[PDB]
Ligand binder design. Sequence first.
Ligand SMILES: */C=C/C1=C(C)C(=O)N/C1=C\C1=NC(=C\c2[nH]c(/C=C3/NC(=O)C(C=C)=C3C)c(C)c2CCC(=O)O)/C(CCC(=O)O)=C1C
Ligand SMILES: */C=C/C1=C(C)C(=O)N/C1=C\C1=NC(=C\c2[nH]c(/C=C3/NC(=O)C(C=C)=C3C)c(C)c2CCC(=O)O)/C(CCC(=O)O)=C1C
Lengths: 457, 457
Amino acid sequence: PVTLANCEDEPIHVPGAIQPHGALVTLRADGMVLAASENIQALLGFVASPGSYLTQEQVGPEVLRMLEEGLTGNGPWSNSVETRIGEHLFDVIGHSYKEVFYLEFEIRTADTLSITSFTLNAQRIIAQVQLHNDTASLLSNVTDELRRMTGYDRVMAYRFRHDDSGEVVAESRREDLESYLGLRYPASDIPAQARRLYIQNPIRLIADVAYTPMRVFPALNPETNESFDLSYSVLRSVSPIHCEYLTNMGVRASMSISIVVGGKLWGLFSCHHMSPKLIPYPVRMSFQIFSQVCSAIVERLEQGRIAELLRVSTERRLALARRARDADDLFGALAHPDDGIAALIPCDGALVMLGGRTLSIRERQAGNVLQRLQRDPERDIYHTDNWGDCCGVLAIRFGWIFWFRHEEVHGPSGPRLTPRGSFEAWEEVVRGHSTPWSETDLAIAEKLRLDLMELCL
Amino acid sequence: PVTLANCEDEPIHVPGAIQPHGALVTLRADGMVLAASENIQALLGFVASPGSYLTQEQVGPEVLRMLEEGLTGNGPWSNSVETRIGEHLFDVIGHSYKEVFYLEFEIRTADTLSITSFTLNAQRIIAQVQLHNDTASLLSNVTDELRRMTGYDRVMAYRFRHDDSGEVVAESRREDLESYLGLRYPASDIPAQARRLYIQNPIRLIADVAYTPMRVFPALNPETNESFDLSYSVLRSVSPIHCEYLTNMGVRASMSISIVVGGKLWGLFSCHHMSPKLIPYPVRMSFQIFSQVCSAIVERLEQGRIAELLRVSTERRLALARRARDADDLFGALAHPDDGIAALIPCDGALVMLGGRTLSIRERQAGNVLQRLQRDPERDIYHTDNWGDCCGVLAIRFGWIFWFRHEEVHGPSGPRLTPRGSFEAWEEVVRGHSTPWSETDLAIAEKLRLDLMELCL
Ligand SMILES: */C=C/C1=C(C)C(=O)N/C1=C\C1=NC(=C\c2[nH]c(/C=C3/NC(=O)C(C=C)=C3C)c(C)c2CCC(=O)O)/C(CCC(=O)O)=C1C
Ligand SMILES: */C=C/C1=C(C)C(=O)N/C1=C\C1=NC(=C\c2[nH]c(/C=C3/NC(=O)C(C=C)=C3C)c(C)c2CCC(=O)O)/C(CCC(=O)O)=C1C
């Protein structure tokens, strides 16, 4: 059973059930059926029974042909074919994962996307990704054009911050609907397995959120004694918790393009529609490759950006050391506040103590902080938050130096599963926390302390 | 008739013919046949005749359905369909240009490419473009991964200097064949029309070089009284001049992927084959989009690179001005080989002159040159090639400054058309010529002279 105590650790990769707008058949390395969704009979003619091998008179030759390329091919298998199976026309989408071949049969609604039509869906959106250098403009434009293409009632862009939280930084919507721009949610809203998954699969599609699921039996794969890993499964079922959530939001369909940098989920477009919605495989695949393209683009953009700040920041420090290694009045040289310490690390106020002289840029607290480093009389550095009249504190020793950051930063069945009810849960994590001290800030204060450890007279 | 005098003016966009590995039908905006290749009957079993309208019984319903969505469309029409006609299965590629509908029939000789397989070609190759942050690692890698994909037996990469000349900066070949790296050709080797084109069309495919062409009739479009524009036409016809060339090279097939920065041809991968070869539409359409991605990835890398040189460069001047303006010894500040003016513009030698005192860093050519501008006694700036013993000369007045570049830089049926033969007619135009003075170099000397216009004492 699934609750708020239990959402942190839920195995959404091996649910043992899909969604009903398709069917699933799992087969082993020799094509023998190991398991099938329970609507196979309802969607198609056959009764896929463990032990059986698929036959032309069940699934068509196109599928068998396809599946064969798979069983004899060597590496990971991915492929599809547009086959008529008796009731309807189908997109049969296969892959192998672990030591299992999945054959997901999703429903087609005509007609064939020309290869060409497919190439300019891709090229149309990609094109929107390469007009801009700013990362914000980039997100803002794609968010827009995605909606034009999909028709989704709402297209959104989320950024993820080092602390694994989330912000909505772009939007294009139906105006009947509330705006989300600026909203903030915690890491806890996307459990490690959702996340680790959004990285693995560029795209997710949820078609009906109040869909009532469809199980695969057996729930457990005889060959391996473990359940089936539907990680790469298209129709893989959605967790119930996130379903209670989207319903509290009044949303019936979902769709997510991923944006990945380093080995990490850096952001993601999440499309919403207020009635059920299905984006056909071929078109998903467009946006699949878009996701590959967008991710690289952002990586280089963001490394260039960061490298810059990193340089102006280091170029500052060095400027300051050369200005002191060559300057007397180390206090006054540290001090034309504009050349000052507070100009090196992002803070709200800072402090330069040495000898019996102080200056509170942007004195008394200094005899209290040195009095809390009384029990660690050999610390040359100090870093904390959540604390006088400031919670963010970073301290270096050579005389000392301090930088400060305050913190004025900024139905259902369960409580917190709501847009504003997640933002409220957020505030708590942040009401006693200043902007944390980047890897960089620890390096700067560090290189600085050393730099001033060179000065002799 | 086409000669070496007639190479640069040849209209290769309006040949009135195509390659024979397919057939072409043109139609006015209402479907009526305006012209067709002289090989339709042979290939297809129709006699597409001006005045006719195509009918299901010759072209299949699939085409007509396509064509109709074109006629009743609004914008630039592009699309295609994999129909079977009487003898063969076909890739039928259509587009509208000017006010005409081209229907090109290219013989299909494979199994269908799954939308999935297609996407992995796209993604495989794209992944290559995104591994590297260096522009040369980039070319080198993709240049390789392309051959693995296509199987072409020689695939090269070309960069294009500002004078629109060429240079093979990467390669991957069948060992039996001579290597090409470092090779250089003139602008003349690619006339502004072929270049205009490669910019318009990501991809060109030459199927057989000694192909003996197939004409379209009438040669001239009655509606317009002009010839048909076959840019954007896939089966368009190759110039004979370039055909003689590839043959003098012992090359039978071709294919090129464009790389475009600014509105300009920045480089392009060219694929060669010592025997006939033919990439299918759909695959070409993977590389089409690849080309789009690759072009962008390159544009941003190069603007970053250049944005950087341009900064280290400017930061230099500024450094230099503050050193001169803030010391009394200018000669000593302006000629310190490290604070050197020689450090500002990329040269082989330089010179500082003011009063009766000079210094030849890295002097006689100067006596002649200050004698040249004797007939122009109100110039404050000078620049030239191809000229004593140094040909590159740039001079600024304040008191004078000079920068120098010597230029030690570095069968058939027609005279020149050959690899080592275009390089021979490349040299004779560059020998007198020193590395030309960049747009950037004229801005640096100018800024400098102005900066020094500043010093009062
Ligand atoms: C403890 C488990 C979960 C909590 C708590 C929760 O809120 N969701 C939990 C499970 C899953 N969430 C999944 C995706 C997801 N969750 C969010 C969180 C939000 N916080 C907000 O304030 C808002 C909106 C105002 C949201 C949506 C987001 C943004 C996402 C990504 C997809 C989306 O944006 O719709 C998730 C993955 C499900 C799947 O698709 O398989 C699970 C499970
Ligand atoms: C003045 C007209 C031409 C001269 C001179 C000539 O050499 N070719 C002329 C016509 C065309 N050339 C086209 C493409 C093209 N030409 C070159 C020139 C080279 N210089 C070299 O050193 C080498 C090889 C070592 C070559 C090939 C190149 C590189 C290219 C691009 C295509 C390729 O690399 O194979 C051209 C376009 C024809 C078309 O495809 O429509 C025309 C016309």
